[PDB]
Amino acid sequence: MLNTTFANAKFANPFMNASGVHCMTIEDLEELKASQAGAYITKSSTLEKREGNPLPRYVDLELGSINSMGLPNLGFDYYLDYVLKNQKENAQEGPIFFSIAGMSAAENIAMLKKIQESDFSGITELNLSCPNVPGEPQLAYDFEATEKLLKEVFTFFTKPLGVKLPPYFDLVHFDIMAEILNQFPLTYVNSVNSIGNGLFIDPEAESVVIKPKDGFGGIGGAYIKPTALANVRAFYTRLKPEIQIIGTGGIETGQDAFEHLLCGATMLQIGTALHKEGPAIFDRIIKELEEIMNQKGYQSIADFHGKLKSL
Amino acid sequence: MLNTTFANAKFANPFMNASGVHCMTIEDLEELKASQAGAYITKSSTLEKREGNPLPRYVDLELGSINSMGLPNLGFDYYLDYVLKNQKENAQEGPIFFSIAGMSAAENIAMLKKIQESDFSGITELNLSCPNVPGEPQLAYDFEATEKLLKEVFTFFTKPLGVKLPPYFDLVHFDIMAEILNQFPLTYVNSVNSIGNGLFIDPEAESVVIKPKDGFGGIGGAYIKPTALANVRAFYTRLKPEIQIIGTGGIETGQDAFEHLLCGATMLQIGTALHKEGPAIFDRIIKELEEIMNQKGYQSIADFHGKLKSL
Ligand SMILES: Cc1cc2nc3c(=O)[nH]c(=O)nc-3n(C[C@H](O)[C@H](O)[C@H](O)COP(=O)(O)O)c2cc1C
Ligand SMILES: Cc1cc2nc3c(=O)[nH]c(=O)nc-3n(C[C@H](O)[C@H](O)[C@H](O)COP(=O)(O)O)c2cc1C
Ligand SMILES: [Mg+2]
Ligand SMILES: [Mg+2]
């Protein structure tokens, strides 16, 4: 009942891991492939392998999580080699997603050029919102810089491309971003990356709980669902139909998934909840969403996709 | 134990209501005066009385609240007359706070001029984050416009003035705002107003829960504490000491209060929790904070104010 069409491709269900979670190594990726996830995405990569920030850099919270990973990854070549080898096997229903988060525009352009030149037939996700890179301002909050980068990207990148965006909190910003994005042959927008630079404190120790950036880190989980849903919905009503949406943020139960789909998301990514539960979460959440649909008499996501009602 | 000095004034404790909550009418204000709150602030006013947005416009949530009130208020003159009359009575320890949220710069300047010319001896709070006039942004998200307005304000306003700010999520933005604010003789910064334009959905009815703006509203409560604490802390380490901070966001327990104070807040405002519990919350939270201090052997807020530790 969850069969989904996205980026002109067929997926068994809309669920995927969120980049950054359970996708660092080939072993992680293989575990996602073996799981019930409809699709999966690689850890955002940089040209060079990165160790990331000092530990502790991730902490589970009652209402979600806080992290300042620092883009730890095994390097662009590592992930490209994996997806290219995996592609030849045809042992998977649906293309693999490849995330890139260059440390500079030049780095992103370089990686996109390599992807374009390679035989990669999957989907690419350009991360314009990493809030845990020491000394690096979320690009998607700089509308001028974002438009400039995308214009250069589309002068040569012809393969499926989506952008991972930070959350917006003002309607005028959604209007501005939508206007910018609508001029490009983008495949999708993925809302949202973590609510940036939040803080969690241990009152007993009177200290922060993560080492990097004096304790400031990206917030995920239940804390951000209202923001995530709003971003998915705001873009759904502003983006041209050619640009689909991936909903990310606060997805833990079938109900959370249902809500994102009602807003207009086509694919759904799970970060914090997957980090805590492991790949078994996909089978659980799929069944929860199916139960919700059965109760409502729905046999397809199309029966409610984007049908959120206003009062 | 909780005696606090702020804006060169003495307060019995740091707790106050957050503007917008329990401060619409004279009766509301009198109830806050009768409560254990160390100080209180009036509902953000506009030159003319406003009915606000259509109902439902406020909804209690498990993790906080969502609202799109629409600035309902009894008008500038109503609040000015109240504060001017109570001022003469000298029946209160600590000045009253007066919030203004004009829908245009011209409106804010007009109200500030009236306050300046009046005999008002209290503290004024300029709201630069009420998600007010469509085609906006929240003024404080427009750094250029914010600096321009403040420059004009300080060419004539000599009375105590603080600014109510929206939450920021990127360190560069804190740097930019701090640079702007540090050039003025501002009394304080109040972080934060609601996380803007969030969405809450009733999965059963497949609809939003508030009538205005297709269900989009400001998020408050537990959802926003990480963001609130981060904003208080980020400004505490960037603002010149002359500009103090009022911490607002997710304060429900003595522990939440303790955390805000550890970050650097001097005064504390309660919104959502006060909306749900009523003025009795002040006595409860004061006792909770005092218990925390007693356990740690602290007899003054100075024993831990702004002492949040990094790892
Ligand atoms: C440990 C961790 C690492 C992350 N690293 C990335 C990353 O490399 N690339 C990216 O686009 N998002 C990254 N994110 C953000 C997630 O993809 C997701 O947008 C966020 O966690 C919001 O979803 P959630 O509420 O399900 O956690 C990371 C999140 C976590 C918790
Ligand atoms: C019903 C309601 C009305 C509000 N109206 C105002 C307002 O007029 N002026 C203002 O500065 N903030 C207003 N706010 C925001 C609060 O002052 C406060 O910044 C926010 O609720 C975050 O605090 P909390 O987590 O304790 O709710 C309002 C909040 C609520 C819940
Ligand atoms: Mg599988
Ligand atoms: Mg009193």
XYZ file of C-alpha atoms and ligand atoms in Angstrom:
686
model
C 0.000 0.000 0.000
C 3.066 2.215 0.361
C 4.362 1.916 -3.202
C 5.836 5.298 -4.140
C 6.992 7.003 -7.336
C 9.723 9.599 -6.839
C 12.264 11.127 -9.226
C 10.715 8.976 -11.965
C 11.692 5.883 -9.971
C 9.693 3.219 -8.136
C 10.134 2.503 -4.425
C 8.416 -0.139 -2.278
C 7.698 2.445 0.416
C 8.676 6.082 1.138
C 10.964 5.418 4.110
C 14.698 6.089 4.095
C 17.422 6.889 6.574
C 18.268 10.564 6.936
C 21.802 11.329 5.758
C 24.218 11.213 8.678
C 22.461 8.312 10.373
C 23.437 4.654 9.872
C 25.202 5.337 6.575
C 28.871 5.978 7.341
C 30.376 2.705 6.143
C 29.650 0.137 3.474
C 28.551 -2.159 6.297
C 26.025 0.458 7.481
C 24.719 0.905 3.950
C 24.415 -2.845 3.452
C 22.361 -3.037 6.647
C 20.029 -0.359 5.291
C 19.779 -2.289 2.020
C 18.848 -5.424 3.966
C 16.237 -3.525 6.000
C 12.669 -2.695 4.964
C 13.657 0.864 4.048
C 12.271 1.828 0.650
C 15.530 3.601 -0.161
C 18.675 4.843 1.517
C 21.183 7.657 1.312
C 24.917 7.861 1.965
C 26.529 9.984 4.670
C 27.230 13.499 3.362
C 30.717 13.365 1.964
C 33.567 15.781 1.425
C 36.451 15.385 -1.020
C 38.727 14.296 1.829
C 38.005 11.778 4.565
C 37.102 13.566 7.810
C 37.385 12.429 11.414
C 34.762 14.948 12.488
C 34.501 16.838 15.772
C 35.757 15.735 19.218
C 33.555 13.505 21.378
C 31.080 13.522 22.916
C 29.346 14.847 19.801
C 25.968 13.110 19.860
C 23.568 12.716 22.762
C 20.161 11.043 22.986
C 17.553 13.287 24.604
C 14.091 12.503 25.955
C 12.546 14.654 23.219
C 15.060 13.940 20.474
C 18.779 14.449 20.060
C 21.546 17.017 19.855
C 24.701 16.617 17.798
C 27.713 18.356 16.340
C 29.246 15.493 14.372
C 31.460 17.715 12.233
C 30.824 15.851 8.968
C 32.797 12.707 9.755
C 32.890 10.648 6.553
C 35.125 8.297 4.599
C 35.530 10.633 1.637
C 33.834 11.163 -1.710
C 35.756 8.434 -3.571
C 34.786 5.820 -0.986
C 31.058 6.437 -1.412
C 31.242 6.858 -5.193
C 33.049 3.535 -5.526
C 30.389 1.805 -3.367
C 27.372 3.128 -5.261
C 29.001 2.454 -8.639
C 29.688 -1.182 -7.719
C 26.280 -1.652 -6.128
C 24.638 -0.192 -9.238
C 26.005 -2.937 -11.498
C 24.476 -5.650 -9.294
C 20.816 -4.734 -9.869
C 20.043 -6.305 -6.488
C 17.892 -3.420 -5.279
C 14.493 -1.902 -6.064
C 15.090 1.821 -6.482
C 18.228 3.990 -6.930
C 20.640 4.831 -4.126
C 20.850 8.438 -2.923
C 24.267 10.096 -2.691
C 24.736 13.041 -0.331
C 27.477 15.628 -0.717
C 28.373 18.443 1.666
C 31.478 20.157 0.357
C 33.427 22.485 2.634
C 33.299 25.201 -0.085
C 31.344 25.915 -3.277
C 34.439 24.799 -5.221
C 34.343 21.470 -3.404
C 30.664 20.911 -4.147
C 31.156 21.778 -7.804
C 34.113 19.391 -7.974
C 32.110 16.515 -6.495
C 29.087 17.221 -8.695
C 31.357 17.207 -11.741
C 32.790 13.832 -10.724
C 29.287 12.434 -10.224
C 28.172 13.837 -13.584
C 31.173 12.290 -15.342
C 30.811 8.927 -13.568
C 28.299 6.257 -14.569
C 26.263 6.959 -11.422
C 22.595 6.517 -12.316
C 21.213 7.242 -8.864
C 20.005 10.376 -7.112
C 22.250 13.081 -5.652
C 21.467 15.265 -2.645
C 23.333 18.548 -2.213
C 23.531 19.466 1.475
C 23.131 23.238 1.839
C 22.381 23.114 5.569
C 24.992 21.412 7.773
C 24.849 23.354 11.083
C 27.763 21.539 12.742
C 30.707 22.594 10.582
C 32.978 24.802 12.750
C 33.145 28.248 11.174
C 30.759 27.451 8.318
C 27.394 29.353 7.934
C 24.452 27.300 6.609
C 24.552 28.210 2.922
C 20.777 27.990 2.492
C 20.345 30.952 4.840
C 22.240 33.078 2.314
C 19.719 33.343 -0.516
C 22.093 35.172 -2.861
C 24.909 32.650 -2.379
C 22.486 29.748 -2.745
C 21.091 30.999 -6.042
C 24.600 31.689 -7.346
C 25.761 28.160 -6.532
C 22.713 26.469 -8.031
C 22.996 28.483 -11.235
C 26.545 27.207 -11.710
C 25.524 23.658 -10.807
C 22.812 23.512 -13.449
C 25.117 24.703 -16.208
C 26.470 21.143 -16.225
C 24.672 18.778 -13.826
C 21.970 16.871 -15.707
C 21.434 13.982 -13.289
C 18.719 13.835 -10.591
C 19.515 16.403 -7.909
C 17.797 17.422 -4.708
C 18.816 19.908 -2.033
C 18.807 19.315 1.730
C 17.563 22.526 3.326
C 17.725 24.017 6.815
C 14.412 24.950 8.438
C 12.864 28.349 7.680
C 10.668 30.214 10.152
C 9.248 33.126 8.185
C 6.782 32.919 5.301
C 8.678 35.534 3.268
C 11.712 33.245 3.383
C 9.683 30.369 1.954
C 8.522 32.700 -0.820
C 12.070 33.817 -1.570
C 13.503 30.294 -1.554
C 10.631 28.905 -3.638
C 11.170 31.619 -6.245
C 14.863 30.731 -6.387
C 14.347 26.969 -6.545
C 11.524 27.055 -9.097
C 13.810 28.369 -11.838
C 15.894 25.178 -11.783
C 15.276 21.616 -13.024
C 15.621 20.350 -9.452
C 14.322 16.875 -8.683
C 13.454 17.606 -5.062
C 13.802 19.590 -1.866
C 14.479 17.784 1.413
C 13.114 19.651 4.455
C 14.501 19.699 7.030
C 18.025 19.344 8.337
C 18.394 19.832 12.111
C 17.172 22.935 13.891
C 20.585 24.550 14.087
C 22.651 25.513 17.075
C 20.415 24.476 19.918
C 21.709 23.835 23.415
C 21.118 21.111 25.993
C 22.300 21.395 29.572
C 22.913 18.909 32.376
C 21.596 20.967 35.338
C 23.351 18.735 37.856
C 26.804 19.190 36.348
C 25.889 22.727 35.229
C 27.466 21.934 31.875
C 26.692 21.287 28.235
C 26.572 17.707 26.964
C 28.590 17.872 23.744
C 32.229 18.898 23.378
C 32.328 20.841 20.111
C 31.194 24.448 19.771
C 30.721 24.984 23.513
C 27.810 22.558 23.499
C 25.816 24.007 20.597
C 24.458 21.438 18.179
C 21.757 20.467 15.731
C 18.455 19.472 17.302
C 16.418 16.563 15.954
C 13.504 14.420 17.070
C 10.172 15.378 18.614
C 11.487 18.890 19.304
C 11.444 19.698 15.616
C 8.384 18.048 14.127
C 6.240 21.213 14.114
C 9.010 22.991 12.222
C 9.634 20.046 9.894
C 5.959 19.674 8.981
C 5.639 23.420 8.412
C 8.613 23.445 6.056
C 7.336 20.463 4.078
C 3.883 22.042 3.803
C 5.089 25.570 3.028
C 7.231 24.306 0.169
C 4.539 21.921 -1.065
C 2.202 24.857 -1.713
C 4.935 26.992 -3.313
C 7.123 24.669 -5.387
C 6.321 23.854 -8.996
C 5.025 20.247 -9.251
C 8.227 19.197 -11.032
C 10.068 19.542 -7.715
C 8.980 16.852 -5.265
C 9.625 16.850 -1.529
C 11.352 14.587 0.954
C 10.088 15.116 4.489
C 12.595 14.815 7.316
C 12.207 15.689 10.979
C 10.601 14.145 14.034
C 9.517 10.953 12.303
C 9.278 8.128 14.834
C 5.780 6.677 14.466
C 3.420 5.855 11.634
C 1.402 8.872 12.734
C 4.407 11.174 12.258
C 4.909 9.683 8.798
C 1.217 10.101 7.991
C 1.435 13.770 8.953
C 4.440 14.424 6.703
C 2.679 12.714 3.790
C -0.489 14.731 4.438
C 1.654 17.857 4.163
C 3.011 16.878 0.766
C 6.183 14.873 1.357
C 6.701 11.988 -1.079
C 9.728 10.300 0.508
C 10.366 10.288 4.272
C 13.684 10.218 6.103
C 14.309 9.082 9.655
C 17.266 10.394 11.614
C 17.134 10.446 15.408
C 14.648 7.569 15.736
C 16.781 5.374 13.461
C 19.887 6.308 15.434
C 18.174 5.061 18.605
C 16.353 1.995 17.250
C 18.469 0.706 14.385
C 17.190 -0.535 10.963
C 14.411 -2.551 12.607
C 12.546 0.757 12.800
C 11.557 0.537 9.140
C 9.513 -2.622 9.568
C 7.841 -1.145 12.649
C 6.939 2.226 11.155
C 5.765 0.679 7.877
C 3.287 -1.462 9.798
C 2.168 1.514 11.875
C 1.480 3.607 8.774
C -0.321 0.711 7.101
C -2.513 0.306 10.191
C -3.456 3.990 10.063
C -4.336 3.657 6.380
C -6.351 0.479 6.931
C -8.387 2.205 9.645
C -9.164 5.071 7.268
C -9.849 2.750 4.346
C -6.854 3.984 2.359
C -5.034 1.584 0.047
C -2.578 4.063 -1.450
C -0.620 7.063 -0.230
C -2.342 8.943 -3.055
C -5.556 8.700 -1.025
C -4.233 11.362 1.345
C -0.959 12.716 -0.031
C -0.850 16.486 0.435
C -4.498 16.606 1.506
C -3.864 18.381 4.806
C -6.954 20.424 5.542
C -7.093 24.024 6.686
C -9.855 25.231 8.989
C 17.651 34.126 47.527
C 16.268 35.225 44.164
C 16.747 38.976 44.589
C 17.708 40.369 41.185
C 19.103 43.653 39.871
C 18.111 44.456 36.293
C 18.017 47.719 34.339
C 19.344 49.429 37.478
C 16.209 48.297 39.314
C 15.581 45.824 42.135
C 13.247 42.843 41.778
C 12.281 40.235 44.387
C 12.888 37.432 41.891
C 13.611 37.144 38.132
C 10.252 35.705 37.067
C 7.788 37.524 34.837
C 5.040 36.673 32.405
C 6.040 36.629 28.748
C 4.293 39.359 26.758
C 1.127 38.016 25.169
C 0.262 35.791 28.118
C -2.036 36.853 30.982
C -1.554 40.559 30.296
C -4.333 41.668 27.953
C -6.529 43.576 30.390
C -6.068 45.640 33.517
C -7.602 42.702 35.400
C -4.953 40.353 33.984
C -2.198 42.776 34.930
C -3.579 43.193 38.438
C -3.557 39.420 38.842
C 0.106 39.359 37.830
C 0.801 42.157 40.311
C -0.902 40.133 43.044
C 1.079 37.002 42.123
C 4.619 36.123 43.201
C 6.029 37.262 39.853
C 9.057 39.500 40.347
C 7.841 41.731 37.528
C 5.345 41.767 34.692
C 4.935 43.071 31.174
C 1.947 44.329 29.202
C 0.576 42.686 26.064
C 2.360 44.025 22.967
C 0.299 46.969 21.835
C -0.407 48.764 18.592
C -1.669 52.323 18.171
C -5.199 51.067 17.597
C -7.091 48.345 19.430
C -6.981 45.011 17.585
C -9.361 42.061 17.690
C -6.644 39.730 16.439
C -6.988 36.672 14.220
C -10.006 34.331 13.900
C -10.445 31.457 16.367
C -9.223 28.905 17.122
C -5.893 30.720 17.386
C -4.236 29.075 20.390
C -3.926 25.391 21.188
C -2.295 23.582 24.111
C 0.038 20.804 22.972
C 1.645 17.957 24.909
C 5.078 19.495 24.302
C 4.065 23.144 24.383
C 1.714 25.316 22.375
C 0.989 26.751 18.954
C -0.650 30.102 18.327
C -1.405 32.787 15.781
C -3.087 35.360 18.012
C -2.721 38.207 15.531
C -1.679 40.821 18.092
C -5.045 41.241 19.823
C -4.695 44.149 22.262
C -6.656 47.036 23.737
C -4.499 49.731 22.158
C -1.476 51.787 23.160
C -3.423 54.451 25.078
C -5.129 51.823 27.233
C -1.843 50.336 28.436
C -0.089 53.696 28.789
C -2.892 54.983 31.010
C -2.739 51.869 33.188
C 1.013 52.003 33.763
C 0.968 55.771 34.347
C -1.732 55.431 37.009
C -0.121 52.476 38.802
C 3.218 54.261 38.707
C 1.840 57.016 40.962
C 0.532 54.498 43.491
C 4.049 53.288 44.341
C 2.369 50.031 45.346
C 4.858 47.831 43.543
C 8.470 46.674 43.930
C 10.140 47.043 40.564
C 9.035 48.933 37.420
C 6.379 47.614 35.054
C 7.451 46.567 31.546
C 5.604 47.973 28.532
C 5.645 46.039 25.259
C 5.033 47.623 21.872
C 4.676 45.893 18.513
C 3.761 48.462 15.887
C 2.936 47.073 12.454
C 5.138 49.600 10.786
C 8.310 51.396 11.723
C 6.403 54.611 11.713
C 3.964 53.097 14.254
C 6.778 51.972 16.569
C 8.454 55.360 16.389
C 5.134 57.046 17.184
C 4.574 54.884 20.263
C 8.161 55.298 21.460
C 7.775 59.074 21.086
C 4.624 58.996 23.204
C 6.348 56.897 25.866
C 9.364 59.219 25.845
C 7.148 62.288 26.260
C 4.968 60.692 28.946
C 5.991 60.434 32.595
C 6.464 56.668 32.221
C 9.396 55.664 34.425
C 9.250 51.954 33.677
C 10.907 49.713 31.114
C 9.907 49.437 27.451
C 10.216 46.349 25.263
C 10.238 46.768 21.487
C 8.894 43.623 19.817
C 10.885 42.967 16.638
C 9.615 39.436 16.241
C 5.852 39.410 16.160
C 5.276 37.652 12.769
C 2.782 40.472 12.059
C 2.347 41.981 8.555
C 2.245 39.603 5.537
C 5.024 40.098 3.014
C 7.171 40.719 6.095
C 9.768 39.126 7.538
C 9.903 39.196 11.339
C 11.760 42.507 11.463
C 14.679 41.041 13.410
C 15.406 38.669 10.522
C 16.153 41.712 8.364
C 19.434 42.924 9.850
C 19.555 46.030 7.655
C 16.026 47.124 8.544
C 16.593 46.369 12.224
C 19.722 48.498 12.446
C 18.014 51.331 10.562
C 15.051 51.333 12.952
C 17.179 51.202 16.092
C 19.384 54.052 14.889
C 16.308 56.259 14.524
C 14.934 55.114 17.882
C 18.069 56.078 19.767
C 18.159 59.566 18.291
C 15.407 60.392 20.791
C 14.519 57.520 23.146
C 16.447 57.896 26.403
C 14.352 55.639 28.644
C 15.118 51.962 29.408
C 14.580 49.920 26.254
C 14.938 46.252 25.450
C 14.209 44.331 22.260
C 12.244 41.078 21.980
C 14.038 38.948 19.408
C 13.086 35.931 17.303
C 15.307 32.857 17.619
C 18.471 32.620 15.511
C 19.933 29.318 14.327
C 23.288 30.217 12.830
C 26.314 31.521 14.721
C 27.099 34.132 12.081
C 23.648 35.602 12.668
C 24.398 35.965 16.378
C 27.646 37.715 15.446
C 25.862 40.066 13.057
C 23.057 40.905 15.497
C 25.466 41.355 18.412
C 27.553 43.776 16.353
C 24.412 45.749 15.521
C 23.031 45.793 19.060
C 26.330 46.609 20.780
C 26.463 50.070 19.186
C 23.339 51.177 21.040
C 22.588 52.088 24.677
C 20.130 49.196 24.867
C 19.053 48.026 28.303
C 18.445 44.418 27.285
C 17.732 41.729 24.734
C 14.880 39.279 25.314
C 15.461 35.892 23.648
C 13.301 34.333 22.443
C 9.904 34.944 20.917
C 8.184 31.821 19.524
C 9.823 29.546 16.994
C 7.977 30.990 14.034
C 5.562 29.368 11.655
C 5.468 25.833 12.949
C 2.620 23.455 12.196
C 0.579 21.029 14.285
C -1.755 18.480 12.759
C -4.683 16.446 14.057
C -4.016 13.139 12.232
C -7.558 11.882 12.876
C -9.237 14.886 11.251
C -6.326 15.276 8.818
C -6.395 19.003 9.505
C -4.504 21.812 11.189
C -5.606 23.004 14.625
C -5.603 26.780 14.304
C -7.664 28.817 11.874
C -5.346 31.662 10.764
C -2.565 31.258 8.224
C -3.614 27.754 7.169
C -2.619 26.430 10.581
C 0.885 27.909 10.813
C 1.721 29.452 14.163
C 4.367 30.298 16.718
C 5.651 27.348 18.722
C 6.348 27.638 22.442
C 6.983 25.324 25.368
C 9.265 22.308 25.696
C 9.692 22.204 21.905
C 11.761 25.361 22.002
C 13.904 25.221 25.107
C 17.072 24.052 23.309
C 16.713 26.991 20.929
C 15.838 29.438 23.707
C 18.818 28.447 25.852
C 21.146 28.629 22.851
C 19.979 32.142 22.008
C 20.360 33.362 25.589
C 23.842 31.833 25.800
C 25.014 32.961 22.359
C 24.061 36.552 23.117
C 25.459 36.395 26.647
C 28.936 35.692 25.268
C 28.651 38.344 22.528
C 26.798 41.314 24.023
C 28.607 44.094 25.848
C 27.923 43.820 29.618
C 25.807 46.984 29.495
C 23.118 44.993 27.675
C 21.520 42.427 29.978
C 19.369 39.501 28.899
C 15.860 38.279 29.581
C 15.490 34.559 28.938
C 12.209 33.338 27.486
C 11.284 29.933 26.127
C 10.378 26.546 27.544
C 10.398 27.646 31.168
C 8.065 25.443 33.202
C 10.137 24.099 36.096
C 12.766 25.433 38.457
C 15.268 23.367 36.492
C 14.355 25.166 33.257
C 14.794 28.485 35.061
C 18.125 27.359 36.506
C 19.329 26.482 33.008
C 18.399 29.892 31.582
C 20.183 31.623 34.468
C 23.253 29.423 33.978
C 23.294 30.597 30.364
C 23.320 34.253 31.337
C 19.694 35.377 31.538
C 18.973 37.861 34.336
C 15.173 38.039 34.129
C 13.018 35.077 33.056
C 9.680 35.118 31.263
C 7.069 32.385 31.228
C 4.620 32.071 28.359
C 3.060 28.703 27.573
C 3.361 27.311 31.111
C 1.708 30.427 32.556
C -1.047 30.196 29.949
C -1.779 26.650 31.127
C -1.315 27.056 34.891
C -2.256 30.639 35.675
C -0.389 33.034 38.049
C -0.018 30.321 40.693
C 2.915 29.109 38.596
C 5.174 31.816 40.002
C 4.970 30.567 43.569
C 5.576 27.005 42.376
C 8.565 27.729 40.154
C 10.150 30.066 42.709
C 10.101 27.265 45.272
C 11.477 24.785 42.742
C 14.399 27.063 41.877
C 15.063 27.748 45.549
C 15.142 23.995 46.230
C 17.710 23.507 43.463
C 19.848 26.290 44.920
C 19.551 24.945 48.470
C 20.712 21.515 47.297
C 23.757 23.090 45.652
C 24.431 25.384 48.596
C 23.681 28.539 46.612
C 22.179 31.548 48.378
C 22.176 33.976 45.451
C 21.666 33.733 41.703
C 25.141 35.265 41.427
C 26.526 31.928 42.636
C 25.782 30.414 39.231
C 24.607 33.162 36.890
C 26.164 32.664 33.458
C 28.498 29.951 34.740
C 27.416 27.299 32.226
C 30.396 25.042 31.671
C 31.748 23.856 28.346
C 33.394 20.446 28.017
C 24.132 12.069 14.187
C 23.495 12.888 13.078
C 24.248 13.199 11.936
C 23.750 13.942 10.861
N 24.530 14.233 9.731
C 23.892 14.729 8.553
C 24.600 14.735 7.336
O 25.773 14.317 7.196
N 23.908 15.235 6.219
C 22.626 15.715 6.236
O 22.075 16.138 5.225
N 21.974 15.687 7.448
C 22.578 15.209 8.604
N 21.839 15.187 9.780
C 20.531 15.638 9.915
C 19.450 14.565 9.501
O 19.636 14.134 8.180
C 18.024 15.032 9.748
O 17.849 16.107 8.778
C 17.776 15.501 11.252
O 18.340 14.645 12.198
C 16.304 15.832 11.380
O 15.628 14.497 11.447
P 15.210 13.679 12.781
O 14.234 14.534 13.509
O 14.566 12.394 12.349
O 16.477 13.410 13.548
C 22.388 14.411 10.921
C 21.632 14.106 12.067
C 22.150 13.349 13.147
C 21.247 13.065 14.329
C -0.843 33.142 23.304
C 0.530 33.765 23.106
C 0.625 35.117 22.740
C 1.842 35.778 22.540
N 1.905 37.134 22.179
C 3.153 37.825 22.272
C 3.166 39.232 22.224
O 2.149 39.940 22.092
N 4.427 39.847 22.329
C 5.617 39.181 22.479
O 6.688 39.769 22.570
N 5.552 37.807 22.530
C 4.347 37.117 22.444
N 4.366 35.732 22.529
C 5.509 34.951 22.694
C 5.982 34.832 24.192
O 6.233 36.095 24.757
C 7.167 33.894 24.367
O 8.254 34.608 23.710
C 6.907 32.443 23.756
O 5.641 31.936 24.058
C 8.111 31.592 24.093
O 7.933 31.263 25.535
P 7.247 29.929 26.151
O 8.072 28.778 25.687
O 7.294 30.034 27.650
O 5.830 29.888 25.654
C 3.064 35.038 22.725
C 2.973 33.683 23.086
C 1.734 33.026 23.289
C 1.747 31.565 23.690
Mg 15.661 -3.586 1.572
Mg 3.435 40.566 43.352
